[PDB]
Symmetry: C2
Subunit: 113 residues, 2 copies
């Protein structure tokens, strides 16, 4: 609702963007993601290449960060780093809460500078 | 133009937000900022309290980061930390470039977790 309007705005900004972005609901479900995000996490696991070449460790780390973000309350945000397929990334997460205490979290990812 | 539309979207997302955000043009001019950002940097210098209690060192650091962001090209982004009035902050910067090679940079700031 007001969540849908928020999503439409994120989409307007990020739909054609090189910056991988997504928005997830309280059930860890993606409710918005752009092409860049889809492509980033579409890399097939290469389990033998190294410990960062599968999604599972990073998934738990990122889900854990997201839970922390949800817990910090409306407007809470932070930036952290993680490794994925041999590259270092940063991720910013932000808590957006709505009048019905519905919580969504914005993810924005970049390659580490 | 297309910059104005981008700005309208950022405004829709961040106008009522606790998250300090701004957008600056190539001449280091603010073309959008929300209330949270205005309030953050409205703190009067307290030059005697410590080296982080004035805007000048952080201004040069942040302007330097911004120039790097501009140089990295469309879609470039990174997260860094800085100190201001005795607190640690993170800042994410993102390069948004338009078809006429007009460059704007989004700033998003948070208190360090
Ligand atoms: Cl980190
Ligand atoms: Cl830093
Ligand atoms: Na909370
Ligand atoms: Na460049």
């Amino acid at each position: 609702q007001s969540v849908n309007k928020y999503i439409l705005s994120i989409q307007d900004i990020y739909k054609n963007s090189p910056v991988p972005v997504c928005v997830r609901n309280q059930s860890r479900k993606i409710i918005y993601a752009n092409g860049a995000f889809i492509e980033l996490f579409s890399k097939e696991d290469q389990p033998l290449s190294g410990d960062s070449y599968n999604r599972y460790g990073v998934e738990v780390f990122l889900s854990s960060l997201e839970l922390e973000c949800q817990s910090l309350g409306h407007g809470a945000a932070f930036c952290r780093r993680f490794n994925f397929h041999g590259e270092i990334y940063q991720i910013r997460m932000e808590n957006i809460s709505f009048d019905n205490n519905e919580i969504i979290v914005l993810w924005q990812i970049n390659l580490f500078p």
